[PDB]
Ligand binder design. Structure first.
Ligand SMILES: [Zn+2]
Lengths: 145, 49, 107, 86, 49, 83, 57, 43
RNA sequence: AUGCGA
């Protein structure tokens, strides 16, 4: 009976809600394997850009609302980067926007690893021909969606 | 820990969901007939044991 | 909040519910010796407002009785003073998702 | 002669012949067409623990599933047998 | 019914079913507890089967 | 139960489950002499025909996404991002 | 080398139509009865796993 | 076993029984908070 | 059910 509701919540066929998100990220295991292999995606960037080209879809969704919450949450996160001193003013971005609709609503764990990759690889971004952490970050958010 | 002992990888999404279903009542609600009693689908009860 | 030293008699326990326009809570003075809310396995419990509850129940289109349950005698329910029907927001860090927000209805 | 029909005839075409396709489970028209029955019964699986004292037993007074549409018989009185042996 | 928190058809969820079975059980305990009548005060015979 | 279209909040993308069912039902209709809105271009399998219709959004079908509440969002094929 | 008697190759079976149990109308069992292979409980579970509910129905 | 054989009523206090009927009525509608709040009505 | 292929 246990399945995914259309609202991304896991409800049983009864209707009883079990989780507000699948594993808390709404990620499919059959997808995840490379969702955290950033460098690989980068060396094969243009191919993935040819697969997930966003210009077809940039008309169907919002690229800011989640990004803006990302801005306030980035503020509290840089301020609060002890556990029981939680972000009670800011739920995670996945709580406030359907992750399939506003590009950027992503687990803070995934966001953190992605940014940390972008910082530790700024030098590959100083070895590339035509790629940036804003277009690369855009690609990784779109892969996440 | 049980799977790690056998060095098997299992996504946390699976285990964590299962646990959430075991706590659906706020307790340690096993998966046998006893825990099944409180679910609402009567045929599912009929068709187990 | 009434902190007893060892025990309270059940006859007084019939007095515990006896003054409606008010709550009385009995607590083990030895069982309070540790704050379970500081324990590393206990995520953050945050009490939801009546409006935060109404909004959550709207966004998910469901009855209160359809949420996952937390028992009224759950230690954390006793800590927060959870009334019946009360929804608590649980912010838990996941080994995979990071911060993950779940909810529980106190019934 | 005798007649055909003591069971079924194809009410579609007036063809009073019947086929058995045991592989199909189907009784069909020997000359023409269609399904004479979709239903097909008694060819059990691998589960006849035989607890059944099955006291019944055929004795030709409850007829038979008629699994032969082929027929001719005759009117009988009831078990020639004694007249046969006589 | 004003609040739409139920309907003419009732309200049914796993937790409601659970509270019902718990209630009916303690109820059965009260029904069995009386070792003499209350409404009539009479001493019923013990029933064996 | 009718969630107004202006208010639709669900995934702009067709799930594999949606794509599968649409292609199955629409293929079946085309196979029952529903009017084809695309060049048969030689094909004989009704399913690949339905695939051609999906690629052109000629499918005249709408998805009713259910919510466990009972509210639903009626989505056309011609809008739900096919892939 | 020895040829094992289990030429289950010969034991193949197919049923596209056949007899039914009188109490169920479901395919009888057994190669010799032209019976139909069983979709057990786990195969049902697996077909729900795939989400293929129209295949399961 | 729960009945009274001389009156043919339940051996539980009639008003207490009615309290039980009340609770189970509230649980047809699943109004749990009120089902527990019912016990307090006292004089 | 007993023996057995997988
Ligand atoms: Zn009595």
């Amino acid at each position: 009976g246990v399945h995914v509701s259309y609202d991304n919540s896991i409800r049983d066929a009864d209707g009883t809600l079990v989780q507000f998100m699948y594993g808390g990220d709404a990620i499919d295991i059959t997808k995840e394997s490379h969702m955290t292999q950033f460098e690989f995606c980068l060396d094969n960037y243009y191919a993935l850009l040819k697969k997930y080209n966003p210009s077809a879809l940039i008309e169907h969704l919002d690229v800011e609302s989640a990004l803006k919450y990302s801005k306030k949450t980035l503020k509290y996160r840089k301020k609060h980067s002890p556990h029981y001193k939680q972000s009670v003013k800011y739920d995670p971005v996945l709580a406030k926007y359907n992750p399939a609709k506003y590009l950027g609503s992503v687990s803070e764990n995934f966001q953190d690893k992605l940014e940390s990759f972008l910082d530790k690889n700024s030098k590959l971004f100083k070895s590339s021909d035509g790629v940036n952490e804003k277009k690369f970050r855009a690609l990784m958010q779109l892969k996440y969606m | 820990n049980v799977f790690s002992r056998y060095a098997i990888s299992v996504s946390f999404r699976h285990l964590d969901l299962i646990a959430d279903m075991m706590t659906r009542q706020g307790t340690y609600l096993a998966f046998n007939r006893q825990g099944m009693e409180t679910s609402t689908s009567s045929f599912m009860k009929m068709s187990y044991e | 909040i009434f902190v007893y030293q060892n025990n309270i008699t059940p006859s007084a326990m019939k007095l515990v519910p006896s003054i409606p326009p008010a709550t009385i809570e009995t607590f083990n003075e030895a069982a309070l010796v540790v704050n379970i809310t500081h324990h590393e396995l206990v995520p953050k419990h945050i009490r939801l407002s009546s409006d935060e509850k109404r909004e959550l129940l709207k966004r998910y289109r469901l009855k209160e009785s359809q949420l996952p349950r937390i028992q009224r005698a759950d230690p954390v329910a006793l800590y927060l003073g959870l009334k019946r029907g009360e929804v608590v927001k649980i912010i838990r860090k996941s080994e995979t998702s990071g911060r993950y927000a779940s909810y529980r209805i106190c019934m | 002669m005798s007649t055909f029909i003591r069971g079924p005839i194809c009410g579609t075409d007036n063809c009073p012949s019947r086929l058995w396709r045991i592989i199909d489970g189907r009784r069909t028209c020997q000359y023409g067409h269609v399904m004479e029955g979709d239903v097909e019964f008694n060819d059990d699986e691998d589960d006849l623990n035989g607890l059944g004292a099955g006291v019944i037993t055929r004795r030709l007074n409850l007829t038979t599933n008629a699994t032969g549409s082929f027929q001719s018989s005759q009117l009988t009185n009831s078990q020639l047998l004694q007249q046969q042996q006589r | 019914l004003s609040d739409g928190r139920t309907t003419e058809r009732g309200s049914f969820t796993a937790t409601v079913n659970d509270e019902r079975k718990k209630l009916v059980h303690e109820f059965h305990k009260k029904l069995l507890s009386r070792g003499k009548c209350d409404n009539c005060g009479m001493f019923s015979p013990k029933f064996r089967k | 139960k009718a969630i107004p279209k202006d208010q639709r909040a669900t995934t702009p993308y067709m799930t594999k489950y949606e794509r599968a069912r649409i292609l199955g039902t629409r293929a079946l209709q085309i196979s029952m002499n529903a009017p084809v809105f695309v060049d048969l271009e030689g094909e004989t399998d009704p399913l690949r025909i339905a695939m051609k219709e999906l690629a052109e959004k000629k499918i005249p079908l709408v998805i009713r996404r259910y919510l466990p509440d009972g509210s639903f969002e009626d989505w056309s094929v011609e809008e739900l991002i096919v892939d | 080398y020895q040829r094992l008697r289990h030429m289950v190759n010969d034991k193949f079976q197919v049923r596209s139509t056949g007899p039914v149990n009188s109490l169920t109308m479901q395919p009888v069992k057994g190669r010799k009865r032209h019976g139909g292979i069983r979709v057990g409980e786990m195969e049902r579970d697996a077909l729900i796993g795939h989400g293929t509910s129209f295949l399961l129905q | 076993r729960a009945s009274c054989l001389f009156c043919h009523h339940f051996r539980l206090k009639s008003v207490e029984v009615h309290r039980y009927a009340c609770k189970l009525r509230l649980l047809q509608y699943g109004l749990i908070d009120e089902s527990y709040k019912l016990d307090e009505i006292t004089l």
